[PDB]
Amino acid sequence: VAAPYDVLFEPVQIGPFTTKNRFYQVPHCNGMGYRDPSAQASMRKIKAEGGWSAVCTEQVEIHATSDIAPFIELRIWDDQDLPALKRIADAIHEGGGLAGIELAHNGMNAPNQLSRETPLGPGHLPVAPDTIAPIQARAMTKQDIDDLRRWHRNAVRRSIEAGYDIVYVYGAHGYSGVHHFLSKRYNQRTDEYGGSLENRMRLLRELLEDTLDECAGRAAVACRITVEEEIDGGITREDIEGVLRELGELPDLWDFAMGSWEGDSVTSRFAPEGRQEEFVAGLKKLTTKPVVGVGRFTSPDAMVRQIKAGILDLIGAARPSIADPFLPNKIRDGRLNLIRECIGCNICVSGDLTMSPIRCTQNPSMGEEWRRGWHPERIRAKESDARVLVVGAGPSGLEAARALGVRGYDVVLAEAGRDLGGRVTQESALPGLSAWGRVKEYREAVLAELPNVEIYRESPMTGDDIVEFGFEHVITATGATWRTDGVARFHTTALPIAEGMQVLGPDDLFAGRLPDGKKVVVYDDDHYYLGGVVAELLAQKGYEVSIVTPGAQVSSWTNNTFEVNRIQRRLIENGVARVTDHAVVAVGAGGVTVRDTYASIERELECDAVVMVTARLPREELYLDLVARRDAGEIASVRGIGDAWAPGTIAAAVWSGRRAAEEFDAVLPSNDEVPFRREVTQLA
Amino acid sequence: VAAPYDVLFEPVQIGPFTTKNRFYQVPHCNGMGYRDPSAQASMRKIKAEGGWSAVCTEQVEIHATSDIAPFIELRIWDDQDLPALKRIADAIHEGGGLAGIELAHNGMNAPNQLSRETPLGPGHLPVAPDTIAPIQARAMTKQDIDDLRRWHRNAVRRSIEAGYDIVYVYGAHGYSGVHHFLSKRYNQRTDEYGGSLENRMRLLRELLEDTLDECAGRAAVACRITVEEEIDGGITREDIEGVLRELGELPDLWDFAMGSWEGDSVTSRFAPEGRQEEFVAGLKKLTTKPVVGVGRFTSPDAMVRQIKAGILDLIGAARPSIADPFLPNKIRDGRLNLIRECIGCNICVSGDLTMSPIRCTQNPSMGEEWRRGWHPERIRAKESDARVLVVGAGPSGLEAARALGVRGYDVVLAEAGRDLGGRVTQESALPGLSAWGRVKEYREAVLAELPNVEIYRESPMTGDDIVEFGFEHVITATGATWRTDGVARFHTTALPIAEGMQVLGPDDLFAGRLPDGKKVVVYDDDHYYLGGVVAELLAQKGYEVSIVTPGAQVSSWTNNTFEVNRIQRRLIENGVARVTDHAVVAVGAGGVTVRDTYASIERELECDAVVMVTARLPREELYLDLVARRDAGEIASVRGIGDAWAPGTIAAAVWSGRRAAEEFDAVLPSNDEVPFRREVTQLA
Ligand SMILES: Cc1cc2nc3c(=O)[nH]c(=O)nc-3n(C[C@H](O)[C@H](O)[C@H](O)COP(=O)(O)O)c2cc1C
Ligand SMILES: Cc1cc2nc3c(=O)[nH]c(=O)nc-3n(C[C@H](O)[C@H](O)[C@H](O)COP(=O)(O)O)c2cc1C
Ligand SMILES: Nc1ncnc2c1ncn2[C@@H]1O[C@H](COP(=O)(O)OP(=O)(O)O)[C@@H](O)[C@H]1O
Ligand SMILES: Nc1ncnc2c1ncn2[C@@H]1O[C@H](COP(=O)(O)OP(=O)(O)O)[C@@H](O)[C@H]1O
Ligand code: SF4
Ligand code: SF4
């Protein structure tokens, strides 16, 4: 490797092992935990062979008192968990990588809703944080602490038996007993485990020493540690420095992380690349040992920076690794222009928070590797001589055309408007969504290296043109329009709209049209990002803006992306009125009628204009026109794709297109069958 | 069987099969879907053994387009699911009952977050109801309806293979495609599946006929249908009546239920027993087939009335059957005083919505039958001649005593107060909570029939007493008190409280004390029921009330028990102000300072009094004392349980009490091991 990037491929000693390079995939969930272990093995194996030197598993509950149901992570309670763990460690090895396992006791943060065990913590407190479950933790005695230590030790043993190279002590994200013992916020103990740094670090020390003694140099010991909590009384700079000074010589590796998962995986919308830096700068100097840090790292020169300036030894990533499993190899090979950069959407997390195998906006193969055999980079050779027309160049069209391109097909990509990108382009122009543009960039950067793909950019297409042009196969990727009649979830049918009121939708704002008068009401019955984003826009542009939502919070689905609090603070700071728990039930000439969701009390709200952000209808005129022409015999295949088939997130659109690409000319089972593989429960 | 109740023990023909009696357990979820098949088997067998003539599984997804993850129900996608379904039906049979299977396709209610397949519905809409997933359902074509019909046919085949006696076409709760086709709220179609009632009923007709053909005298065909949806253009009395005029003679059994699950499983806090009669009356005359219905039926007289008045043929029950699997046998045998009545807490539902095996406040063995060997009625016999002291007659100590009592142990139950029941008594007295006393009545009923248990009211106990009387084995069920320092989740350490202000906790209210002046602030950081119920008590007494809570809704955890909307509604009607998204960060002499949770903005709120509803500290002074004395060789054993151990719900305390009793005198595995049996994933 050369240029300035050779720095990123130096070996690093971690205890008795050596990395091939400085790329480190840190522990991250996957929504396919104790429940889809083959799925995980396949994925982790792909990260390894993509160039990540160490590959970590998500956290792994060491004991049934660490039950965090409904969350589905990995488990190491018993020898019954071994075969699953061993497969993952095996798959990473055979992929060329060192395997990491993040042993975890969630302590006071485990509600134990499934095991029905008592949670254990430093104090008698409601289970916390990131949960409001009606259960309290019991304060641990010395005997309980000794019990915890033994469970941890058993878990480490079993990690050696499974073949892991790196075994963590986990003390990060408010999710660990160890963090709760460290933090003045949860530890108000008065015995030797509380009261002062030396004491609050006691448990940490003990778990470290125990893990070391138990490994006996057959594995390395990592410690993943909270470095900044971002709350009063929480872990600060002073604490982390004291820990490093006393214990810095103890593990084989120090992984640095935020005291909060909200804080750790913040979206691009709310944070730039490498923001963890000024919480971590200065810490390397304190330890003989190597250091990993994160910072949504996508730019290879930012990675170069982190190492030359002595902030980090390993470049850690979670999400960058999900977006592009092959990021290390693309840097290796000089093809930097082909890096699929994380968008920082958070969609990946929402899989975990909805106990689904995590989706990536950028990488449709995430969670398809085992079950459908998809690959982040490769796709089967073309099975035919076909010429395919993809109509519409939004996320779904772009990905169909990219993937069919990569297969070797002769593909013509037709686009109606001046620009490529569809909703990605219209959406990234919105406040705080600039990075989303990257979905379009990667696809263009790869399309450019495909001579077999023709792109035509000011070319609307009708069923007529397609037949006249003689196109035998079409993929119809035409998108969706935003309803203006007020229908989504609260109304399933049009609400009444007086003739005198200006009513716009997102199509109008994307087209550059803006409300006429000063006061605007945005009716948000979508509950994801767009309502809030549109309202941001209007207020920046000088309008007086109210959001009306049937939810108790604006953009309530963002609970699933950890954005919900940030969204609300951001709305309150732009002076936007949050009119939550209300539906718009009438639009009159000079205002709207809102109805409270709980008691149906109605009120008038005066305004000069109304912007509807509710739901969408597919652009399927072309498709239905072509199905008619297929039945008649004038073409051989049409397939609807993306938002024109059934509107969803951008990720779903991207996925939708890759699916069409992988399925083109495939001989398929009838749809009676499950279109993927799955593991099922082992009967006793 | 005694002469009033003998009618409930008459055989009822259900296609090819005959019930032993009229007790029918309707479909209900359990949080052990495809994940824990054996647990469910043990639970369904016990129900059959309890005298329930038909026992049904929860809804079974028939296809991967019907994926309702994160909810974890059963599946029948294909043959890999058969071993698991076959075990459930064999268990019911071994139990002596008929096995039902609720085959269901969720259509547009299926967000498909795990399958990533396109949801299917009568039109292009966002997935609904009760989900805000960013995904829309595709409008089915005739070809999609033929596909669906075929998938349902396949599932019926497989149901018969697995050995089920009754097979449902499911059209209820707004959770199936059948209901969305049937309801004008979701069906706006103009082809043969919409417009007239004849048309919207057509899918149902078609699935009914197909299911009957496929069955062919091998299984009975049940139809579970929405009789009232409780919303504007939804299904109503004229709709179901017409369905019955035309279709009444098709299925073998009609199962009548509500049009939303909020509507169907209504808490007893919000609805009396038999609430669904205003809705099913008159429908039985329109069909010759047997008819099942639910009403949270716990009163045997109420049951005799349903049958005698021609309302039902079968007494349907979900939650009453969870609270008491052995309810039919108790009535048969004439032991009506031993029935454990549902309290209408919905704590069970909370299992489904948090993807955990369901708990029941009344029945701590629900969820434990397989994994720990518990039984709702049988406890294994005493293993020694021991004499046990149980201090505290709250839920915890009552169930321990009752359980130890049934084993044959000599037991002494000492209680400090005039009353038994502890928090059950104190809390039952609160508005809407009276049914919760049934927790105590049940245990009193069984204790009355146990000469080997002795109960001392008005007997506060101390360390010296106990040792003095020469008790060897003590269970300390002493409870917890509610904190008045402001600590729970938002604060982990005390907030500042001015000397001049009156501050009350729930313990004061239970004791008879009420705030001194007219204006009251309730700080609620408990997030479950008590704050809102406390606020309702005060409004009812003439106080002017404000509830301040960091959640976006008052009682936010009641999202999990389907009361959250009802609760906000009831607070508005009582004129209680909802200061949501706020914490109390200071209590001054004539008001409080509140801090907005998002943007950190503080207002003052003036009041004459503050009632703190936050969290709890255990009353464990006695246990700590006896632990000392145990280590002096003065007693042989002590165990803290219930809220004295770690505060929780009433259900957790009951469970805790039963756990102490099942565990008594047993040889236990080290706590290193998993305290229960458990199934893991089958590696492929
Ligand atoms: C889908 C998702 C799941 C993750 N789960 C965990 C976890 O199980 N263990 C943990 O310590 N960190 C977990 N994290 C945090 C990551 O390890 C990482 O510290 C964080 O995502 C920031 O790094 P990034 O910018 O590379 O994403 C999770 C983050 C992601 C994206
Ligand atoms: C834990 C829980 C799970 C349920 N799940 C389903 C279900 O899978 N399908 C359905 O038909 N009804 C389900 N229900 C509704 C019940 O079948 C029943 O109609 C409702 O609980 C009212 O009857 P009850 O008053 O006897 O509880 C569920 C209810 C509860 C208690
Ligand atoms: N008849 C048509 N011919 C060519 N392109 C079209 C036609 N109708 C729509 N388009 C283009 O299809 C694209 C749809 O993209 P988008 O709205 O992002 O959909 P998706 O989210 O499915 O990718 C838009 O860029 C639009 O300009
Ligand atoms: N020292 C004592 N001796 C006897 N009874 C006690 C003593 N301390 C507390 N109790 C009783 O124990 C009961 C605890 O009930 P409760 O608070 O409902 O706990 P749980 O929910 O665990 O049952 C109360 O009725 C209280 O009077
Ligand atoms: S889903 Fe979004 S935030 Fe997650 S890895 Fe992919 S691009 Fe990054
Ligand atoms: S949890 Fe409550 S409502 Fe449910 S079956 Fe038990 S007592 Fe009944």
Cα gap A539→A520, rounded to integer Å: 9
**Where, residue-wise, is CATH 3.40.50.720 in chain A?**
381-482+616-673
B103: left (phi > 0), else alpha (psi -120 to 50), else beta? beta
Residue B557: list chain A partners with CB under 8 A: 132-134
* B27 in contact with ligand 2, CB cutoff 6 A: yes
Residue A202 tokens read as 């006691």
Q: Which residue of B has its CA nearest to A557?
A: B132
Interface of A with B in 100-129 (CB under 8 A): 113-119, 123-126, 128-129
What pairs with residue B519 in β-bridges?
A: B544
**Where, residue-wise, is CATH 3.20.20.70 in chain A?**
1-380
* A655–B116 CB contact, under 8 Å: yes
Select from A313, A148, A174 the least CA-distant residue to A231: A174
Please tell me the class of the A381-482+616-673 domain.
Answer: alpha beta
Cα gap B355→B564, rounded to integer Å: 19
Gap from CA of B348 to ligand 2 centroid (Å): 10
- Nearest ligand 6 atom to the CA of B343 is 7
B555 touches chain A (CB under 8 A): no
Residues 6+ apart with CB under 8 A from B406: B379, B446, B450
Q: Rg for chain B (alpha carbons), in Å?
A: 27
Give the residue numbers of B marked as catalytic: 175
A423 touches chain B (CB under 8 A): no
Contact B477, B400 (CB under 8 A): yes
A13 touches chain B (CB under 8 A): no
DSSP letters along B62-93, please? -SGGG--TTS--EE-SSGGGHHHHHHHHHHHH
**Residue B342 counted as an annotated binding residue:** yes
Gap from CA of A435 to ligand 5 centroid (Å): 11
* B424 in contact with ligand 6, CB cutoff 6 A: no
B600 burial via Cβ count (<10 Å: 0-12, 13-18, 19+): exposed
| Resolution given for this structure, in angstroms | 2.7
B541 burial via Cβ count (<10 Å: 0-12, 13-18, 19+): exposed
**Residue B607 counted as an annotated binding residue:** no
Selecting from 3.20.20.70, 3.40.50.2300, 3.30.565.10, 2.40.160.20, what CATH number does the domain B1-380 have?
A: 3.20.20.70
Q: Where are the alpha helices (DSSP H) in A602-668?
A: 621-632, 650-663
Cα gap B28→B100, rounded to integer Å: 11
Give chain A's end-to-end CA distance (angstroms, integer): 52
Other CB atoms within a 10 A radius of the CB of residue B193 amount to 18
A5 burial via Cβ count (<10 Å: 0-12, 13-18, 19+): middle
SS3 B319: helix
Q: Kindly identify the ligand whose nearest atom is closest to the C-alpha of B347.
A: 6
* B126–A615 CB contact, under 8 Å: yes
Gap from CA of A342 to ligand 5 centroid (Å): 5
A17 touches chain B (CB under 8 A): no
Gap from CA of B317 to ligand 2 centroid (Å): 8
- Nearest ligand 4 atom to the CA of B397 is 23
* A474 in contact with ligand 5, CB cutoff 6 A: no
Cα gap B119→B59, rounded to integer Å: 17
Residue whose token pair is 């263009």: A444
Looking at residue A117, what DSSP letter applies? Answer: P
Q: Which residue of B has its CA nearest to A36?
A: B681
Q: At what angle do helices A237-247 and A202-215 cross, to 10 degrees?
A: 40
Residue B586 tokens read as 């200071």
Domain B483-615: give its CATH superfamily.
Answer: FAD/NAD(P)-binding domain (3.50.50.60)
Gap from CA of B470 to ligand 6 centroid (Å): 39
Interface of A with B in 148-167 (CB under 8 A): 150-151, 154
Select from A342, A292, A302, A305 the least CA-distant residue to A322: A342
Count interface pairs A-B at CB distance under 8 A.
Answer: 244
Looking at residue B23, what DSSP letter applies? Answer: E
Give the sign of the dihedral formed by CA A486, CA A491, CA A493, CA A498. Answer: negative
Interface of B with A in 523-542 (CB under 8 A): 526-528
Cα gap A346→A649, rounded to integer Å: 12
**Residue B224 counted as an annotated binding residue:** yes
Residue A677: list chain B partners with CB under 8 A: 684
Gap from CA of A443 to ligand 5 centroid (Å): 16
Long-range pairs, B94-97, Cβ under 8 A, ≥24: B94/B45, B94/B48, B95/B44, B95/B45, B95/B46, B95/B47, B95/B48, B95/B49, B95/B55, B96/B20, B96/B48, B96/B49, B97/B20, B97/B47, B97/B48, B97/B49, B97/B52, B97/B53, B97/B54, B97/B55
Q: Out of A170, A175, A193, A523, which one is annotated catalytic?
A: A175
Q: Which residue of A has its CA nearest to B682?
A: A682
* A344 in contact with ligand 5, CB cutoff 6 A: yes
**Where, residue-wise, is CATH 3.50.50.60 in chain A?**
483-615
| Sheet-wide strand order for B125-126 | B120-121, B136-139, B125-126
Residue A334 tokens read as 């000089």
Q: Which residue of B has its CA nearest to A357?
A: B114
Residue B134: list chain A partners with CB under 8 A: 526-528, 557, 648-649
**Residue A59 counted as an annotated binding residue:** yes
Q: What are phi and psi of B485, to 5 degrees?
A: -95, 0
A315 touches chain B (CB under 8 A): no
Residues 6+ apart with CB under 8 A from B667: none
CA atoms within 13 Å, Cβ hemisphere of B633 = 0
- Nearest ligand 5 atom to the CA of A366 is 6
Q: Pick the residue of B116, B347, B489, B549 with the most A CBs within 10 A to test the interface with A by mutation.
A: B116
Select from B398, B439, B387, B391 the least CA-distant residue to B415: B391
Contact B250, B208 (CB under 8 A): yes
Q: Kindly identify the ligand whose nearest atom is closest to the C-alpha of B654.
A: 4
Q: Which residue of A has its CA nearest to B183?
A: A492
Pocket test of ligand 2: the residue of B103, B167, B264 to mutate, having most ligand atoms within 8 Å of its CB, is: B264
Contact B502, B609 (CB under 8 A): yes
